[PDB]
Amino acid sequence: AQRKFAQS
Amino acid sequence: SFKCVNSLKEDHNQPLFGVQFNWHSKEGDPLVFATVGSNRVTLYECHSQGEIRLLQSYVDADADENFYTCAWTYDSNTSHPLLAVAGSRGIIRIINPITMQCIKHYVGHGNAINELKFHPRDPNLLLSVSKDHALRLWNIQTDTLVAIFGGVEGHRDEVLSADYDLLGEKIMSCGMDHSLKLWRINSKRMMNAIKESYDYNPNKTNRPFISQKIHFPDFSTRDIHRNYVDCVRWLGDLILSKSCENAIVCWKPGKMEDDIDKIKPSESNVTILGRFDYSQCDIWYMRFSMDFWQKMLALGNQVGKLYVWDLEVEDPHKAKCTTLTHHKCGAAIRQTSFSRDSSILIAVCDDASIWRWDR
């Protein structure tokens, strides 16, 4: 429901 | 105001989730900070010309460990600085920063540890918050679990952050359930349990040490944020906390005039005093920090931008903000730390990079 990373 | 005077990158090429300057240092000693990422913790000294000298590292025997956080204290026994570290394995390691060996370690959390904090007055009192929905209080002098905070009125998802107040009488915690929770540890019961943890000696007994099961906080609220609360900090009797909605909120339980120590657990009101806005910081696990005097506040975002607010103003809404940017810094800044004398600011990133900004 919510991401910890914005990068690959 | 600040200038970027250096950067480097660690060779594990994994995210650095944590950084802490050692404020527990001595007269004129070199300025040292620790970084945590991958399965290692690394020590650097700061020198002039923006030099960052790598000292030693500890790498965990387990290649599957991923450390998320660390915290400095004093070893009560030898009087040297200690460093506690923890992450995905849910195991607290106590590291001798001089020799970078693990002296001892604590297991118990049913999962990853998200945050560690030492009591501001008593160097032996370690707080841990966990993916298992619980906070735990440890006495690292006698190796006892003093208390587990969780259960009936405890958090209902991962606890992401927590903080002792200035005096070390209470703790505010926060997490994925959107709530912030107050836990007094100056109650007669907790003071007494702490007294007992000090009086515990397993060589001279066969009784185990019994933890307190604190199921009910002394205040709870979900009316500050609408998503994961991933960093909380006391500012005197006020709270600073952030979700992943691009603002740090400054607030207090109850009405403007209500004393924090008169607040009852039934209290349903909160007073918002200020908001610190910024951009592009919607991922969770992004932590802000303050200098020793709490005159300033630092937070990095997911595109490598560093915000610093001046908190030295009558009212929170008035604070001005400086943004630090570098064309080579484009990865998420997970956490920042100020040197004790406020002269250096360090930021660490998702691309394993470390950034030094000099005041």
Author numbering:
A (entry chain B): 24 to 31
B (entry chain A): 81 to 439
What does the paper say about this structure?
PRC2 is responsible for the di- and tri-methylation of histone H3 at lysine 27 (H3K27me2/3), a histone mark that correlates with silent or poorly transcribed genomic regions. Here, we reveal an unexpected crosstalk between Jarid2 and PRC2, with Jarid2 being methylated by PRC2.
Our previous work showed that the C-terminal domain of Eed forms an aromatic cage that recognizes H3K27me3, leading to allosteric changes that stimulate PRC2 enzymatic activity on H3K27 (Margueron et al., 2009). Jarid2-K116me3 peptide exhibited ten times more affinity for ΔEed than H3K27me3 peptide, with a dissociation constant (Kd) of 3 μM. To further explore Eed-K116me3 interactions, we solved the structure of ΔEed co-crystallized with Jarid2-K116me3 peptide and compared it with the structure of ΔEed-H3K27me3. Within the two structures, the Eed aromatic cages largely superimpose and the Jarid2-K116me3 and H3K27me3 peptide backbones significantly overlap, despite some differences in the aa sequences. However, Jarid2-K116me3 peptide forms additional contacts with Eed (red circles). In particular, the large hydrophobic side chain of the phenylalanine at position +1 (F117) lies alongside the stem of the methyl-lysine and could contribute to the stabilization of K116me3 within the hydrophobic pocket.
